[PDB]
Write a protein that binds this ligand. Structure first.
Ligand SMILES: CNC(=O)c1n[nH]c2c1CCCC2
Length: 164
């Protein structure tokens, strides 16, 4: 069904996350964590306090798809177990910063060809696939985008609802 998913997304905020590679999304799916640059980290921490759910929608650059979406379960924190992210050649791991805990809502992919009818008012009404890492997606567009993903029958949203 879609009813618990709609409940989780009600009055949520949504952010596009762009990963340079599949490896970091695979790590995020295995470990329930994400890290971003400080500019986006500050935005996500503000949003986490502001809304009942903050949803990250992931897309690997050049893949032509989204790889799934997840809900922040924490603000960012330092000092945890290190994550061996793959970073650009010139970048150190400290340039990233804190680690957000996330609960996956859908680990399945959605090709950009399926979201061509959705535009993001917060990015000049460009197709929702277009945007920089951290771009906020307006509520209606983000909700409709999440509802386009194939159902992930491995997920039980019961425990996520209780965290809200
Ligand atoms: C795990 N997090 C990431 O791989 C990430 N998220 N945003 C950026 C990066 C690396 C490159 C700079 C911009």
């Amino acid at each position: 069904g879609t009813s618990k998913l709609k409940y989780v997304l009600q009055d949520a905020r949504f952010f596009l996350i762009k990963s340079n590679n599949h490896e970091n999304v695979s790590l995020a799916k295995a470990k329930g964590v994400w890290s971003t640059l400080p500019v986006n980290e500050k935005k996500l921490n503000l949003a986490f306090r502001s809304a009942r759910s903050v949803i990250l929608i992931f897309s690997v650059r050049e893949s032509g798809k989204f790889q799934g979406f997840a809900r922040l379960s924490s603000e960012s924190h330092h000092g945890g177990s290190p994550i061996h992210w793959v970073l650009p050649a010139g970048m150190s791991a400290k340039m990233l910063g804190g680690v957000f805990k996330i609960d996956w809502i859908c680990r399945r992919e959605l090709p950009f060809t399926k979201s061509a009818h959705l535009t993001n008012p917060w990015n000049e009404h460009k197709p929702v696939k277009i945007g920089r890492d951290g771009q906020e997606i307006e509520l209606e567009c983000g909700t409709q985008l999440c509802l386009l993903f194939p159902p992930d029958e491995s997920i039980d949203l019961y425990q996520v609802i209780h965290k809200m």
